[PDB]
RNA sequence: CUAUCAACUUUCGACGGCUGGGUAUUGGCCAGCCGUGGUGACAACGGGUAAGGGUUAGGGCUCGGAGAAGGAGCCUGAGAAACGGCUACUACAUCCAAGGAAGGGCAGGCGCGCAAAUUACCCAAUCCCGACACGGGGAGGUAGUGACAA
RNA sequence: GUAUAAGCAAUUAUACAGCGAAACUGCGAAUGGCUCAUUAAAUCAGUUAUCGUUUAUUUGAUAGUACCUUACUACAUGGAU
């Protein structure tokens, strides 16, 4: 566990130390053969077996906050950790490298994931209910909860009817594929296969509010955000012609402001009624941004940015200034905060899935109590 | 909370009964491996500092280094970890252990004296305990004794004396069979090895030459037929 | 879940048979490996007979053969440009067999100017196809991957040249 | 652990060797074409009685097969492998008969010094050197350049050197080692190619009986020249 | 047909996929504000 | 699609075409020799080799991409009738673009490594006749 | 000697400098004997190339380390792939001004030698040896690799190269 | 054996070819791309469940799917998806100082209140497994009962 | 292969020597067998092929690979249990 910046310190309590680590086999040979002397005090991990040995894809934390589900790539699996028991509860293999997973229950008792071989897989504790193939390739996943329906965006343009583009939406009380919502993606080559072209033709991100009204927002590769209203099942708005692909999409706690982002690396915080951007920030380099979420240090509101330059930037919302910047030293593919405060679980490319602790953002969560005493010890040592 | 006090340099150890959690209070919320002074413990313990290395709480559970849960927790131990030995090969077993956080619910604390003080613990630092066995391999004996090239580990090895049975016979010595000691039989082993190498290559050279002249012979006969 | 047996498919005459047995160990087929660009990540898999095969998951460099002149060099890999199997693979920047990808040209240009002498990309035996010269002036060549990155643990292949080169330029423009 | 009846019927066991029968170990000769050393000692030669007796005899260096001491009990010794026993100083060789059964022959040292082995195949080994595969699973490096497939070689058995060779020839006498006409010593008179698999030879005896055996089962012994002492 | 392997949406009910989750209606707004906002989007 | 190629012949050199004979008394056709067509399952162009059984037959459905269907007729002895009965068998074989396919001809095929679930044979020598449709019956 | 190399590089990193500061991981990975080729090809033609600003501050220590790894006899196997491919790799990935400073490091005593004067021969030079022949063999193989990888960029380095190789050739033929 | 089974497949791709992935390897085995099939009155397809070969005078002789409380995943090893282990869920059951801990099969007797063949001995021979002449073997033989007969 | 058992049993040139518990290391347990909804040329049997693959153990042969700027050197190899 280290401390990267001066003013607002970040703490990488768990995570890889090196950018290019060797084979674990050679590391074990060296450790059991030669003489070593490691920093035994501050070197540890907080959750046993928090790795995958090849890479990682996605982390989420349950609504109850007792279950951490995390997928990894080789022998493509997902581990589930009982965070009260601070260890690996189980580890289940699959047939291909997971793209995106969403939990359903407040515990881990039901999960689903869009999976690289064009599949939706449904996991119980008892096992794995039979997967459903979707016709066209997937990009992300969302779940209408007030009316149970999982919906995936897809790349390419539809088969017949129109040439708009599709978000496959199937209900769970009904079971069938209801209907792909018609979302225009852009013009394609007429001489092409059914799985689109290599340059464009993609819907990327879906995001839905679960406590406010819930406008189903979709983001398309020509930089175009659309809005569908549930209980109407039709298009409401089209806005935001941007230069980058729309890859960022999340609502606020009130249910009014949206924050979307362009793969040049430019975030725009919009209102749902004022088409002028409420806030604009171009940041980092040309590497495409990946994820963004609102969060409140319980007095003040702030915003996450995650992009694969090893850059995560916590911005302010009421001012726009940069609060904190963190360089995760390796690639990273997903970010999540614990719902309590202060800890950011980050899925990466490296072996060890790494989490950050901001003391100025919040306290240590209800299952690692001594992490505050550990930051305490770091301020003792420095 | 009894304390298993161990002096690793002198090689001695002693359990110490400890009442007065008011005296013990400085140990609380300290991770395994943290350095703590023994001056708060007792007036005899002036100038000492000691590290902690684990212990067992009530209901007898071990304390594994590297776990932050202060309560009892439930890990999954693989082969090469502490507090578990594998029943069979390749086994991963889920066991419950106590985290590194020294709480009030412990029963024994493993403590190790790292720097002494001016006073002496009576049963702890006064008593010396030797190492059980001396070094066996030749190079480690050489590093232990700082011998020169001509200084004969065969006569500088450790010896141990015992008495046998037979109603008090002569005392009897024992010597540890120095391993990495070069002998003429080792020399002849290596020499016979390289002799085997050169004999084999000599054989293949001879047979290759004879096959060369036999192929010249058979090609000459086939062309004389032609 | 994944297997290679043919019990579940239909008969040659178009019939369905129960043929209910259990998946044994010799019809095992392992999960695929999306070999992507990054630092070197290779997982070792022991297979029947105790053979080792190296599933390469993240690769940066491989070697490529400019064997027309008789050289080959270990260069980096920028990113895939076209793939005959899947446009999703072209999107997700995956390296498989027969995958055309732009590679760095600097060791090749170094070897060229060292051997023949004339600068390239800035006598009568040192001659270049003009399309290859344009690739050198841009500094990012078109090569193909022909080594199996999944079952060999290395990205190696030959540079593109001539008819295949122009064919793949036309395919990229398609 | 097959039964005595299911054991091959050409290494003989009487009606009292129990319901079981040993299986040969892994070695040069094939499973069906083997005579194990315990069955050679205590069932055919009867130089011992019991499994433990044969264990003791084979444990002391007393039975030598093909010039090398053999330790284990069930070492396979299928076909034309000389068996030198020094305490009796005898050498035994395994041939077949007209019916197709193992027949043991007694030989002294002069004819016991060499072996006659059929060539399985020939290739180039590592380093670019031709090597030669017998049916005894013996590999001879650097052979005579005329020795093709289905040749026969007289082997020194002391240095393993290629002492002589015999050529596959129509007009030569042979011995059969397989097929329904197994073990019928006679002369090769005809070869039929049948390119596409399973070439045939037509082999008659010395006394006017024609039959068709396949080249794989054919084992060349000599044109007239019976280089091994066949039993009279 | 060119489409067997899931390529067309077979609108067929699934036995195990029948009754997974009950709808829990979690919306903090009284729906009049929300559909009045859907009326008063950018367009009005 | 990608560019098709013979596996290890160097094309773009600034300084050939490989085709092997199967043997068995066969002759490679001239379209296989010089015709620039390329396919991996052709025994004269690809790396597929022919060994084992050699069979004949008559094509029935040539309307397929380089694979024919062969009706194999023979006489089945049933003991209850003590009579011979006609039985047709439906094979398949990978057809090379070297030869001129004719429907109803007499084609010799050869056993190869399994190229598909049904395709186990390669065509070697067609013999052109005037074979008719399904209504024709003959042992071949 | 690789242990002395590790201690020396630790000392140079003790010289806390902003020039060496962004490259210490590349230095230790070049030095670790199981990461040499991969660390080389991530150093050169990677995203984190040597910045030309403090290139004059980082190149000397990097080049002395490259000479150490190209001179090492411990970890090398046999054959051309044993240490010859390593030297060829280093010289192929090097640059020409870097090559000039490197050959300055490579020619120890023979950096400032003069083989020809205003007169023809310098017998006072040739009847005195500053180098053992083992080091001469190493120098000469090194320089053959340098020339073979250099090509036409030899022009600013002739007045040293020809002096070196001619001194070696004439001392050899005098030893004949 | 059957047309009270004449249409079947494309409802897990059905037949190709090309491209790759994975497999020890070939292969629609799987992922993209496009083509149109493939089977059938010479009996497809379905239905019924009643699931032999070789050794030739003869009879004899020899040989012949799914699971280890239940799904699901993983591990070693040349050879297993071992049920040997683990991991989570479910269904049981046991100990306790109530904080906690380990665990799942076969054989025998009764199965009316009235009934009837051993809870036997040894690896002695044949055979098998090991660092190995010596250790270990639930195949194998030896023994006991019988008026059911003969 | 690893013995300093604080294990026995001894002397006629003293690192060790004979026997040798425990322990580390290597091998072994792809069956001997039990239960029950069955498998209707797919298994199975003949008949081929592997130029489409794997193989511990078996026996046979088998591997020429130095120097190559450490030199004002190094020359009885390390650490763990």
From Swiss-Prot, chain A:
Main location: nucleus
Keywords: Nucleus, Repeat, Ribosome biogenesis, rRNA processing, WD repeat
Locations listed in the record: Nucleus, Nucleolus
Keyword Acetylation: no
Each WD repeat, start to end: 198-238, 241-280, 287-325, 327-366
One GO BP annotation of this record: maturation of SSU-rRNA from tricistronic rRNA transcript (SSU-rRNA, 5.8S rRNA, LSU-rRNA)
Role: May be involved in rRNA-processing and ribosome biosynthesis.
Assigned protein family: Belongs to the WD repeat NOL10/ENP2 family.
UniProt subunit comment: Component of the 90S pre-ribosomes.
Protein name as it appears in the record: Ribosome biogenesis protein ENP2
Gene it is expressed from: ENP2
Portion held of the full protein: 2 to 383 of 668
């Amino acid at each position: 566990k280290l401390t990267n910046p001066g003013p607002v310190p970040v703490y990488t309590v768990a995570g890889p130390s090196t950018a290019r680590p060797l084979p674990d086999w050679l590391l074990r040979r060296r450790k059991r053969s030669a003489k070593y002397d490691p920093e035994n005090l501050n070197n540890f991990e907080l959750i046993q077996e928090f790795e995958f040995e090849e890479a990682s894809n996605c982390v989420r934390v349950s609504e109850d906050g007792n279950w951490i589900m995390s997928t990894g790539t080789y022998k493509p699996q997902f581990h589930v950790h009982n965070t009260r028991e601070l260890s690996l509860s189980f580890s289940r293999h699959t047939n291909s490298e997971n793209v995106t997973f969403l939990l359903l229950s407040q515990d881990y008792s039901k999960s689903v994931h869009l999976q690289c071989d064009r599949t939706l897989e449904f996991h119980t504790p008892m096992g794995c209910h039979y997967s459903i193939r979707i016709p066209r390739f997937g990009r992300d996943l969302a779940y209408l909860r007030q009316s149970c329906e999982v919906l995936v965006p897809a790349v390419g343009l539809s088969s017949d009817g129109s040439g708009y583009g599709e978000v496959f939406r199937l209900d769970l009380e009904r079971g069938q594929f209801l209907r792909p919502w018609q979302v225009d993606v852009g013009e394609d080559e007429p001489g092409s296969g059914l799985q689109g072209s290599i340059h464009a033709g993609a819907v990327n991100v879906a995001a839905v509010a679960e406590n406010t009204h819930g406008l189903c927002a979709f983001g398309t590769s020509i930089g175009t955000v659309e809005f569908y209203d549930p209980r109407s099942k039709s298009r409401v708005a089209v806005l935001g012609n941007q230069d980058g692909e729309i890859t960022a999409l999340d609502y606020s706690r009130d249910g009014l402001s949206l924050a979307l982002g362009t793969s040049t690396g430019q975030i725009r915080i919009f209102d749902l009624r004022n088409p002028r951007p409420l806030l604009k920030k171009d940041q980092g380099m040309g590497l495409p941004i990946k994820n963004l979420i609102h969060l409140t240090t319980p007095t003040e509101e702030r915003k996450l940015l995650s992009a694969d330059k090893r850059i995560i930037k916590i911005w302010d919302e009421q001012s726009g200034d940069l609060w904190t910047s963190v360089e995760p030293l390796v690639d990273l593919n997903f970010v999540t905060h614990v719902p309590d405060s202060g800890m950011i679980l980050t899925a990466n490319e490296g072996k060890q899935m790494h989490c950050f602790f901001i003391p100025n953002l919040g306290l240590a969560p209800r299952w690692c109590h001594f992490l505050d005493n550990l930051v305490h010890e770091m301020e003792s040592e420095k | 909370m009894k304390l298993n006090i161990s002096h690793p340099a002198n090689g001695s150890q002693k359990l110490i009964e400890v009442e007065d959690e008011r005296k013990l209070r400085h140990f609380y919320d300290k991770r395994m491996g943290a350095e703590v002074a023994g001056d708060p413990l007792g007036p005899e313990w002036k100038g000492y500092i000691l590290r902690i290395t684990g212990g067992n709480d009530k209901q007898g559970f071990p304390m594994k280094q590297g776990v932050i849960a202060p309560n009892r927790v439930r890990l999954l131990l693989s082969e090469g970890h502490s507090c578990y030995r594998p029943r069979r090969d390749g086994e991963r077993k889920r066991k419950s252990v106590r985290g590194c956080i020294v709480g009030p619910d412990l029963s024994v604390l493993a403590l190790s004296i790292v720097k002494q003080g001016e006073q002496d613990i009576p049963g702890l630092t006064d008593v010396v305990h030797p190492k059980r066995l001396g070094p066996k391999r030749a190079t480690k004996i050489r590093r232990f004794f700082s011998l020169s090239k001509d200084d004969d580990v065969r006569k500088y090895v450790i010896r141990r004396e015992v008495q046998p049975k037979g109603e008090g016979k002569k005392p009897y010595t024992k010597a540890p069979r120095i391993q990495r000691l070069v002998t003429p039989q080792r020399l002849q082993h290596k020499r016979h090895r390289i002799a085997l190498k050169r004999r084999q290559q000599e054989k293949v050279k001879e047979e290759a030459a004879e096959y060369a002249q036999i192929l010249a012979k058979r090609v000459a006969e086939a062309k004389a037929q032609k | 879940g994944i297997s290679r047996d043919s019990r579940h498919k239909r008969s040659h005459t178009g019939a369905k048979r129960a043929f209910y047995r259990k998946k044994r160990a010799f019809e095992l087929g392992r999960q695929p490996a999306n070999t992507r660009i990054g630092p070197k990540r290779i997982h070792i898999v022991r297979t029947r007979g105790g053979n080792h095969k190296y599933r390469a998951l993240r690769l940066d460099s491989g070697n490529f053969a400019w064997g027309s002149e008789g050289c080959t060099r270990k260069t980096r890999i920028i990113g895939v440009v076209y793939h005959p199997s899947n446009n999703e693979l072209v999107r997700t920047n995956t390296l498989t067999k027969s995958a055309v990808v732009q590679i760095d040209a600097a060791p090749f240009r170094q070897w060229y100017e060292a051997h023949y002498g004339q600068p390239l990309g800035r006598a009568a035996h040192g001659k270049v196809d003009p399309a290859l010269e344009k690739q050198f002036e841009a500094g990012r060549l078109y090569a193909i991957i022909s080594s199996r990155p999944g079952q060999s643990g290395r990205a190696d292949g030959y540079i593109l040249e001539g008819e295949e080169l122009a064919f793949y330029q036309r395919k990229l423009h398609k | 652990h097959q039964k005595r009846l299911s054991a091959p019927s050409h290494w003989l066991l009487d009606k009292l060797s129990g319901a079981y029968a040993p299986r040969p170990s892994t070695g040069p000769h094939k499973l069906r074409d083997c005579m194990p050393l315990i069955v050679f000692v205590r069932n055919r030669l009867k130089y011992a009685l019991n499994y433990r007796e044969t264990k003791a005899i084979m444990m002391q260096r007393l039975v030598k097969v093909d010039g090398k001491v053999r330790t284990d009990i069930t070492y396979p010794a299928g076909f034309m492998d000389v068996i030198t026993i020094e305490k009796t100083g005898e050498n035994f060789r395994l041939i077949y008969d007209t019916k197709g059964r193992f027949t043991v022959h007694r030989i002294t040292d002069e004819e016991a010094k060499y072996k006659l082995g059929k060539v399985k195949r020939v290739q180039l080994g590592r380093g670019g050197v031709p090597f030669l595969v017998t049916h005894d699973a013996r590999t001879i490096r650097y052979p005579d350049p005329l020795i093709k497939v289905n040749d026969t070689v007289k082997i020194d058995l002391e240095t393993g050197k290629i002492t002589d060779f015999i050529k596959f020839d129509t007009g030569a006498l042979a011995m059969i080692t397989g097929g329904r006409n197994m073990g019928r010593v006679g002369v090769i008179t005809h070869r039929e190619r049948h390119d596409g698999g399973f070439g045939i030879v037509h082999l008659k005896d010395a006394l006017d009986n024609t039959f068709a055996t396949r080249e794989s089962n054919v084992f060349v012994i000599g044109s007239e020249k019976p280089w091994i002492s066949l039993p009279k | 047909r060119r489409a067997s392997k899931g390529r067309k949406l077979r609108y067929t009910v699934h036995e195990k996929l029948q009754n997974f989750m009950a709808p829990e209606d979690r919306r903090s707004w009284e729906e009049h504000a929300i559909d009045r906002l859907f009326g008063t989007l950018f367009g009005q | 699609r990608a560019f098709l190629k013979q596996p290890h012949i160097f094309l773009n050199s600034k300084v050939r075409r490989w085709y092997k004979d199967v043997g068995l008394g066969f002759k490679t056709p001239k379209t296989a020799i010089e015709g620039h067509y390329i396919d991996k399952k052709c025994p004269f162009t690809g790396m597929v080799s022919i060994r084992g059984r050699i069979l004949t037959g008559r094509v029935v459905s040539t309307k397929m991409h380089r694979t024919i269907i062969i009706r194999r007729e023979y006489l089945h002895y049933i003991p209850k009738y003590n009579r011979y009965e006609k039985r047709h068998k439906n094979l398949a074989a990978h057809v090379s673009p070297a030869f001129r396919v004719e429907e109803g001809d007499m084609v010799v095929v050869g056993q190869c490594r399994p190229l598909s679930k049904t395709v186990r044979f390669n065509v070697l020598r067609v013999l052109p006749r005037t074979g008719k449709s399904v209504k024709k019956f003959q042992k071949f | 000697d690789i242990e002395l190399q590790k201690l020396a590089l630790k000392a140079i990193l003790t010289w806390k400098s902003e020039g060496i500061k962004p490259y210490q991981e590349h230095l230790e990975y070049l030095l670790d004997e199981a990461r040499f080729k991969n660390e080389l090809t991530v150093l050169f033609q990677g995203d984190n190339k040597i910045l030309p600003e403090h290139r004059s501050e980082v190149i000397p220590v990097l080049l002395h380390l490259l000479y150490g790894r190209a001179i090492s006899r411990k970890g090398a196997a046999s054959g051309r792939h044993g240490l010859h491919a390593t030297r060829l790799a280093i010289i192929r990935q090097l640059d020409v001004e870097d090559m000039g400073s490197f050959l300055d490091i490579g020619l120890g005593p023979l950096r400032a030698i003069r083989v020809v004067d205003e007169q023809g021969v310098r017998e006072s030079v040739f009847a005195h040896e500053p180098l053992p022949p083992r080091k001469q063999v190493g120098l000469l193989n090194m320089l053959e690799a340098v020339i073979n990888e250099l090509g036409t960029s030899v022009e600013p380095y002739m007045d040293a190269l020809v002096n070196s190789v001619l001194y070696c050739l004439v001392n050899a033929c005098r030893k004949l």
